[PDB]
Amino acid sequence: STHHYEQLIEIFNSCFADEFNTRLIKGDDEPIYLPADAEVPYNRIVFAHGFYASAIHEISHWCIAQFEDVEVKPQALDWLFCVAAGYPFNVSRVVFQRRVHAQVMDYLANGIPERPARFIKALQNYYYTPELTAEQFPWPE
Ligand SMILES: [Co+2]
């Protein structure tokens, strides 16, 4: 499959534009969260640059809502999303990515929270990818 940020906009909106009144928007240099208002009546997650990886990262952060500690769970969702989509994962070293790996394992063993779980299933149906298995997430070596 190809991977274009425009695809993530449609997948995200399909998952969340109704239930959570939230949509994904390609922005400029800044990631932003803009709540619905009287003119634009839906919440907007704005990601920086027309870059697939950047959209994934803002989606992960939205799902979760000392920099290492705060970044572990969003980067774990990043990794899950990328494998679900058939996209290559990188962080943005080995010690930190092992913390992310453990958190992916935690999620897979103990349960993925509702919003990322929904996004993962939609990714799988959009890109026709097999069910996730821990084996698709190699320990950082
Ligand atoms: Co981040």
Residue numbers in the entry: 3 to 67, 93 to 119, 131 to 179
Please quote the authors directly.
A recent study revealed that the β-lysylated Lys34 of EF-P is subsequently hydroxylated at C4(γ) or C5(δ) by YfcM. Although YfcM is structurally different from any other hydroxylation enzymes reported so far, YfcM shares similarity with the ribonuclease YbeY, despite their low sequence homology. Furthermore, the three-histidine motif of YbeY for the coordination of a metal ion is replaced with a putative 2-His-1-carboxylate motif for the coordination of an Fe(II) in YfcM. The structure consists of five α-helices (α1–α5) and a β sheet composed of three β strands (β1–β3).
In order to confirm that an Fe(II) ion is coordinated by the putative 2-His-1-carboxylate motif of YfcM, we prepared crystals of Co(II)-bound YfcM and calculated the anomalous difference Fourier map, using the data set collected at the peak wavelength of the Co K-shell absorption edge (1.6049 Å). The Co(II) ion has an ionic radius similar to that of an Fe(II) ion and can adopt the geometry of an octahedral complex together with six ligands, similar to an Fe(II) ion. Therefore, a Co(II) ion often binds to the 2-His-1-carboxylate motif in a manner that mimics an Fe(II) ion. Furthermore, a Co(II) ion occupies an Fe(II) ion-coordinating site more stably than an Fe(II) ion, because an Fe(II) ion is easily air-oxidized to an Fe(III) ion, thus changing its ionic radius. The resultant electron density map clearly exhibited a strong Co(II) peak at the metal-coordinating site, indicating that a Co(II) ion can be coordinated by His59, His63 and Glu98. In this structure, six atoms participate in the Co(II) ion coordination (nitrogen atoms (NEs) of His59 and His63, two oxygen atoms (OEs) of Glu98 and two oxygen atoms of two water molecules; distances from the Co(II) ion are summarized in Supplementary Table S5), which may mimic the Fe(II) ion coordination. Therefore, our data suggested that His59, His63 and Glu98 of YfcM form the putative 2-His-1-carboxylate motif for the coordination of an Fe(II) ion, as in the active sites of non-heme iron enzymes. Our atomic absorption spectrometry and X-ray crystallographic analyses confirmed the interaction of an Fe ion with YfcM, and the binding of a Co(II) ion to the putative 2-His-1-carboxylate motif of YfcM in a manner mimicking an Fe(II) ion.
